[PDB]
Ligand binder design. Structure first.
Ligand SMILES: CO[C@H]1O[C@H](COS(=O)(=O)O)[C@@H](O[C@@H]2O[C@@H](C(=O)O)[C@@H](O[C@H]3O[C@H](COS(=O)(=O)O)[C@@H](O[C@@H]4O[C@H](C(=O)O)[C@@H](O[C@H]5O[C@H](COS(=O)(=O)O)[C@@H](O)[C@H](O)[C@H]5NS(=O)(=O)O)[C@H](O)[C@H]4O)[C@H](OS(=O)(=O)O)[C@H]3NS(=O)(=O)O)[C@H](O)[C@H]2OS(=O)(=O)O)[C@H](O)[C@H]1NS(=O)(=O)O
Lengths: 517, 104, 104
């Protein structure tokens, strides 16, 4: 009661090959659903179409979500990681919950009184067996804020199950979170928890300096021929023939290659200048969307592909990018100066542009009378010989995602970026233990529905150790570093304004340093 | 005062030949009879026939009753016990009372 | 000649983490192709289209095929495996052939 449970550690430590980023924050937990598990469906949320239909449950539990890069790295630390390392991956995590206070608010006569209840507890358990629906990795809100000065409130845990419209099917499951071994904590008690990440590939935080279709020696020809000429060129009567040429420094497009660009699933190309777009509502009609059990879902951000070709910054794939929102930006139909559209153009070297055909394939058998026809390949699954890069990471974006427990998954790297994990950091769930108001003086079999209004607060630390892969570039000229532009501004970037509101002006990725292909 | 007395264990463990079902709950105890032992009879409850006649005492004490199968088994655990076993019987019990608060 | 070669084992054993399903059966083997290897083709089977065309050989040999789940599991054993386990895979196999009689 009169002794702190922990201290405030919120700094990074660089040990050459690794970096340990600690981050403490203050949280607040209200009582959700008034301590009840309520069944929710698309009909309770005000009904919807069949594509938006759902069936799940709300629970009285809140959960901690530190699955974003800005909860761990400061804008400076991120820049020191982005400009010097070629890859990075997390090694171990260490979550701690302390300095717990369970305040009891009693609203009597318009006058609000908040007093601490020293004997009240909170339950907090971590599902280490992944027996509960994993909700993190869906890019939801409620993360430790990016700025350490502010306090956040803990999001409410709710899960979904199978549905047939707004109804439940036979296999729909109901999970009671009270059926797990929680750990009651009064003020004075603390919660410590450690976790060590499985072996996941380093995140390639570099761009390639060579294009996958220009990996030859521009001074030498090949010893391999290709159909160069099919028709004797002129006379007056040019006829059918067969001429073969050797690929050379002038026919780089016709040369023979060993590899192919990564897979594709074509996207619609919209312009940031609305005057260049067709005047129709194609936000849903012209979108690329997978079909699953009769209902359509937006492929967004979809698999990994370049945003635009050379010199076309104005164009972005309709769904193929991560769009973050500037500070304070609303929720609905916000305009384009209220969001920050990421630019995945550094992978145009290996991955095909999201808004263009993958290739062209012959669709018939040319003959004396039939001539050579060809089609455009919009969707192209992997093939032996393909090579591609994964989506970037974004200091504001997600860190990991749980690889779904299926018996088949190809290249389980999350489409939103990050590290795909089969055993991701577990979900730390926490709620305020109910404290009933004065019960009747005569026995009533009915469950007590009157409770003492309370909420808890306290601090939370999260230490993560990251393994780095230092850059050993033997390049001669200088590289492209991330730098704060030297020009004078009204307010510093990644700093608080004159009202104390912290804001991240732009989305920072990792691909700055270059490397050969 | 500033330290919990116990934790929340409410799950079953299956060890092949036995199953241990734990179940934690939160209770509330009011003051009964205003701390008095009162003599009760069928006449105090508003009289009755001779078949419903009685004579007993009310006490200020409450009592814990976990004598029902649903206090221990969840509908799923009960189904896993009902579909696979031919018989079952209880072996040992372990009651615990903690995190006590006496509000005024 | 006057002594059996083996016994009839045809039951399953559940050891918690694994199940051993034994299954004995009686077979009969006739003489195929009259002891000859004959070349067969779609034309010998009465000709066909190009999609059904083939070329292979018939042999005088028979072969044992226990590649079906019902050769090992009984409808009850299969239900006891289907309702309680999340996955299963085979670990080892043990084939035995006995009590041979060559009737003429
Ligand atoms: C939409 O369908 C319609 O059009 C399509 C094509 O148009 S499209 O692509 O724009 O959609 C037609 O489909 C194409 O043509 C089909 C067809 O004509 O039947 C068919 O062609 C393939 O098979 C044909 C017959 O082959 S056979 O082995 O079954 O006989 C074939 O044409 C025949 O060529 C042979 C040949 O050149 O050998 C001819 O045989 C003659 O010569 C042989 C050898 O000559 S030699 O000198 O003696 O050595 C002799 O052995 C033979 O006795 C002799 N026959 S004889 O009767 O003239 O005496 C034969 O006569 C020809 O009919 C096609 O080859 S080709 O030579 O015509 O180029 C062959 N395809 S190919 O070789 O890859 O070109 C296919 O289904 C299809 O082929 S395609 O090239 O991909 O287009 C479709 O039939 C038509 N149907 S419709 O809409 O209902 O009218």
């Amino acid at each position: 009661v009169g002794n702190s449970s922990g201290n405030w550690h919120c700094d990074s430590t660089w040990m050459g090959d690794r970096v340990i980023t600690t981050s403490t924050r203050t949280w607040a937990l209200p009582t959700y659903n008034n301590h009840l598990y309520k069944q929710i469906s698309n009909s309770t949320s005000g009904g919807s179409s069949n594509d938006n239909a759902y069936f799940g449950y709300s629970t009285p539990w809140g959960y901690f979500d530190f699955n974003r890069f800005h909860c761990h790295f400061s804008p400076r630390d991120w820049q020191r990681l982005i400009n010097n390392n070629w890859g990075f991956r997390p090694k171990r995590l260490s979550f701690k919950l302390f300095n717990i206070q369970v305040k009891e608010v009693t609203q009597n006569e318009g006058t609000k009184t908040i007093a601490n209840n020293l004997t009240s507890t909170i339950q907090v358990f971590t599902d280490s067996e992944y027996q509960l629906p994993y909700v993190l990795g869906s890019a939801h809100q409620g993360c430790l804020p990016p700025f350490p000065a502010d306090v956040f409130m803990i999001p409410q845990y709710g899960y979904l199950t199978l549905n047939n419209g707004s109804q439940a099917v036979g296999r729909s499951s109901f999970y009671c979170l009270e059926y797990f071994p929680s750990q009651m904590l009064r003020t004075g008690n603390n919660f410590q928890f450690t976790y060590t990440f499985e072996d996941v590939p380093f995140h390639s935080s570099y761009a390639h300096s060579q294009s996958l279709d220009r990996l030859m020696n521009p001074l030498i020809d090949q010893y391999l021929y290709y159909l160069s000429r099919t028709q004797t060129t002129g006379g007056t009567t040019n006829t059918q023939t067969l001429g073969f040429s050797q690929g050379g420094p002038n026919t780089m497009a016709n040369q023979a290659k060993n590899w192919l660009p990564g897979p594709c699933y074509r996207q619609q190309r919209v312009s940031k200048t609305s005057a260049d777009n067709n005047n129709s509502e194609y936000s849903w009609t012209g979108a690329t969307k997978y079909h699953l059990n009769g209902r359509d879902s937006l492929v967004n951000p979809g698999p990994a592909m370049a945003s635009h070709k050379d010199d076309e910054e104005k164009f972005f794939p309709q769904s193929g990018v991560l769009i973050f929102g500037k500070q304070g930006s609303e929720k609905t139909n916000v305009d384009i100066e209220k969001v920050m559209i990421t630019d995945e153009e550094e992978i145009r070297t290996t991955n095909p542009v999201a808004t263009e055909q993958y290739g062209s394939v012959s669709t018939n058998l040319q003959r004396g009378n039939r001539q050579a026809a060809t089609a455009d390949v919009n969707t192209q699954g992997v093939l032996p010989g393909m090579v591609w890069q994964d989506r970037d990471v974004y200091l504001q974006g997600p860190i990991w995602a749980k690889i779904p427990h299926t018996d088949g998954h190809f290249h389980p790297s999350p489409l939103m970026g990050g590290f795909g994990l089969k055993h991701p950091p577990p979900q730390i769930l926490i709620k305020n233990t109910p404290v009933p108001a004065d019960p009747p003086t005569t026995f009533n079999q009915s469950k007590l529905n009157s409770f003492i209004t309370q909420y808890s607060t306290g601090q939370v630390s999260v230490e993560i150790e990251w393994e780095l892969q230092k850059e050993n570039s033997k390049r001669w000229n200088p590289e492209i570093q991330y730098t704060s532009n030297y020009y004078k501004s009204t307010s510093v970037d990644f700093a608080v304004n004159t009202e104390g509101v912290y804001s991240e002006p732009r989305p920072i990725g990792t691909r700055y340093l270059t490397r050969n292909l």
